[PDB]
RNA sequence: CUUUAACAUUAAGCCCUGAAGAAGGGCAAAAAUAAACCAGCGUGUGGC
């Protein structure tokens, strides 16, 4: 139902937000470098801007959501898992054009292809315990 | 896909002496060699 440009924009947004949260710089300069120096010919511009703006304005919101779900972890919290959970919970909080099962399926694909071979079940557990709370309608 | 993965470690000898896995050697193979502290010789002169 959706072309590969949305998937490419989502993966480039995962890469850009991981680079922002690990390099710890300004979001505007890193965003301008990532849009003027990387492959953006198959990247949805408005999807990228709205997703990064929502993550940048809901840093503390998604951290407060993640804070009750950082107890039973054997190791400590990684950064790739945090980026996948932030993008997955913003795609399940305010995004109306993206469906519920479609966003969960893309989040599971991102967690299996980027997080780990063992952290994608943690991502799916946090999503299954948070997305009916955030979206009881499951839209 | 519902709440962090991982048990690894496969190589260096043979023989003799020795109470031993305490120690002493040879051989098949080789990169590389401050301090306290006892105490002549060659010229001249002259002499005999």
From Swiss-Prot:
Stored Gene3D superfamilies: NusB-like
Pfam families noted in UniProt: NusB
GO BP annotation list: DNA-templated transcription termination; transcription antitermination
An example Gene Ontology molecular-function term: RNA binding
HAMAP family: NusB
Job of this protein: Involved in transcription antitermination. Required for transcription of ribosomal RNA (rRNA) genes. Binds specifically to the boxA antiterminator sequence of the ribosomal RNA (rrn) operons.
PANTHER family: ANTITERMINATION NUSB DOMAIN-CONTAINING PROTEIN (PTHR11078:SF3), N UTILIZATION SUBSTANCE PROTEIN B-RELATED (PTHR11078)
Protein name: Transcription antitermination protein NusB
Organism in which the protein naturally occurs: Escherichia coli O157:H7
Top-level taxonomy: Bacteria, Pseudomonadati, Pseudomonadota, Gammaproteobacteria, Enterobacterales
């Amino acid at each position: 139902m959706k072309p590969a440009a949305r998937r490419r924009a989502r993966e480039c947004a995962v890469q850009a937000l991981y680079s922002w949260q690990l390099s710890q710089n300004d979001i505007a300069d890193v965003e301008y470098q990532f849009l003027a120096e990387q492959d953006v010919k198959d990247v949805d511009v408005l999807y990228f801007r709205e997703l990064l703006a929502g993550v940048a304005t809901n840093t503390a919101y998604l951290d407060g959501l993640m804070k009750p779900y950082l107890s039973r972890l054997l190791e400590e919290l990684g950064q790739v898992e945090k980026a996948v959970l932030r993008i997955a919970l913003y795609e399940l909080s305010k995004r109306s054009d993206v469906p519920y099962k479609v966003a969960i399926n893309e989040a599971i694909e991102l967690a299996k292809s980027f997080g780990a071979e063992d952290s994608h079940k943690f991502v799916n557990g946090v999503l299954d315990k948070a997305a009916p709370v955030i979206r009881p309608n499951k839209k």
